Write a structure and sequence with these properties.
This is Hybrid PKS-NRPS synthetase TAS1. In the N-terminal section; belongs to the NRP synthetase family. The PDB classes it as biosynthetic protein. The entry lists the keywords tetramic acid ring formation, toxin, biosynthetic protein. This protein starts with a strand and ends in a 13-residue tail after the last strand. It has about 425 residues and is of the alpha/beta class. It has one domain: Thiolase/Chalcone synthase (Peroxisomal Thiolase, Chain A, domain 1, 3-Layer(aba) Sandwich). The strands form four sheets. An eleven-stranded mixed beta sheet has the order 6-5-7-9-1-10-17-16-11-12-14, sandwiched between helices. Strands 2-4 form a two-stranded antiparallel ribbon. A two-stranded antiparallel ribbon has the order 3-8. Helix 3 packs across helix 5 and helix 8 packs across helix 10. Helix content is about 30%, strand content about 20%. The chain has twelve helices and 17 strands.
Length: about 425
């Protein structure tokens, strides 16, 4: 099973285009927004908690035009931004898939598989429409059309539609389902989506005081240092993105230029063995998923696996467990350095959207022949025990050989896992598509 990525659109901190994202990553920039301290927070802090005035903001509504989607300006103001912005990235990714493609090969039926956070706008003070009760205003959650079906309706898409949530693995969960559905013959193309926009907007986030609760995974310092000895948690962020994917056989038959090729995908759940608790990932569970994806990609892919875009969210214990899962997988597969990185120190943790950020960065790296580094790696996390192993965190750009493969991991609260193996389009006898 091989899949061609043929369209992309994204809205991430610092980047509303692939070229903007590439420059954030290659210039080793921090695209998190800092806010002025608020005179009054509007709530009281628990005694062992702090407020950090940083957040991965996006500016996607600056580019959203309600009237392009048969929506009045007044209607648009009461619709979850996640729905408005996802509609825009899905439409732009489909438009992108129509460029550099032989005309007259409709993608239909187009499935829509979107990993999405809960709609937190609806109840929030940020919703201008947050009164005598009617059917329409008494059941606003019922009548909150799921994001994916809303996109199928507004964009006239007729394949399978699913809106799903597996916490921070949601976007790769969506990729997995889209690939299974393509291989099952349910659709001829798939929009694969991730979106998370959190309300109310507070200009920062609450977490534990330094050295307090380690279950409070948000960084007390306000800086995410993946794989680094300074690791102290992640910085939350909003994000939205969509890919269009096709079976590689149809990219060949239909005359599509291709950004990068998916060679293997697997997902799993940790269950409860070898797992410290609901919010602590299992290195065993992760290792099984990585191994499955590498087995599906095949022995040549495995032998050329050169770099992994980790989940890499910058908790010191989570990063260590994720490195351990990679060590376990590759040890089992053996029975030459593999470089490791993350994008969450550039853009924060975009939560349900985060696996799409990683897939896009990996696809761009394969397309351009170079992996952007971590933005600010000083000393590696000693608990990862990189010494005298084949793994090492990537602190400078990594030039790729045309045969090198890249892996991508995303992990979700409660034990959901996903791993994807990607390769350059130029290995597969198809024309490569330019991101910019």
């Amino acid at each position: 099973n091989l899949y061609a990525i043929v369209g992309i659109s994204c809205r991430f901190p610092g980047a509303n285009t692939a070229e903007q994202l590439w420059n954030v990553l290659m210039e080793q920039r921090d695209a998190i927004t800092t806010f002025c301290p608020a005179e009054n927070l509007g709530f009281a802090l628990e005694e062992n908690s702090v407020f950090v005035p940083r957040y991965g903001m996006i500016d996607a509504l600056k580019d959203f035009e309600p009237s392009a989607y048969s929506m009045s300006d007044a209607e648009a103001q009461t619709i979850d931004p996640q729905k408005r912005v996802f509609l825009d990235v899905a439409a732009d990714a489909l438009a992108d898939a129509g460029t550099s493609a032989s005309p007259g090969n409709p993608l239909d039926p187009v499935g829509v598989f979107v990993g999405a956070a809960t709609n937190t706008f609806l109840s929030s003070r940020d919703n201008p429409g947050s009164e005598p009760q009617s059917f329409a205003n008494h059941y606003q959650q019922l009548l909150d059309c799921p994001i994916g079906t809303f996109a199928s309706f507004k964009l006239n898409l007729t394949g399978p539609v699913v809106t799903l949530n597996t916490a921070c693995s949601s976007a790769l969960a969506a990729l997995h389902l889209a690939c299974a559905s393509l291989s099952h013959g349910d659709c001829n193309a798939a929009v694969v989506g991730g979106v998370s926009m959190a309300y109310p907007q507070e200009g920062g986030y609450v977490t534990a005081r330094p050295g307090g609760d380690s279950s409070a995974v948000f960084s007390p310092s306000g800086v995410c240092h993946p794989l680094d000895s300074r690791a102290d948690g992640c910085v939350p962020a909003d994000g939205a993105a969509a890919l269009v994917i096709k079976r590689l056989a149809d990219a060949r038959a239909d005359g599509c230029r291709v950004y990068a090729v998916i060679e293997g995908v697997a997902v799993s759940a940790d269950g409860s063995d070898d797992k410290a608790g609901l919010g602590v990932p299992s290195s065993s569970g992760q290792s099984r998923t990585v191994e499955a994806a590498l087995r599906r990609a095949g022995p040549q892919a495995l032998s050329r696996l050169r770099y992994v875009e980790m989940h890499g969210s910058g908790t010191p214990w989570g990063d260590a467990l994720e490195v351990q899962g990679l060590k376990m997988a590759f040890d089992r597969l053996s029975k030459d350095r593999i470089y490791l990185g993350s994008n969450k120190g550039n853009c924060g943790n975009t939560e349900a959207a985060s696996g799409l950020l990683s897939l896009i960065k990996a696809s761009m790296a394969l397309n351009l022949g170079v992996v952007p580094p971590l933005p600010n790696l000083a000393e590696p996390n000693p608990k990862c025990e990189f010494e005298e192993t084949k793994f090492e965190p990537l602190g400078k750009q990594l030039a790729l050989a045309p045969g090198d493969r890249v892996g991508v991991t995303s992990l979700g609260y409660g034990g959901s896992n996903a791993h994807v193996v990607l390769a350059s389009a130029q290995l597969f006898g198809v024309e490569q598509k330019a991101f910019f």
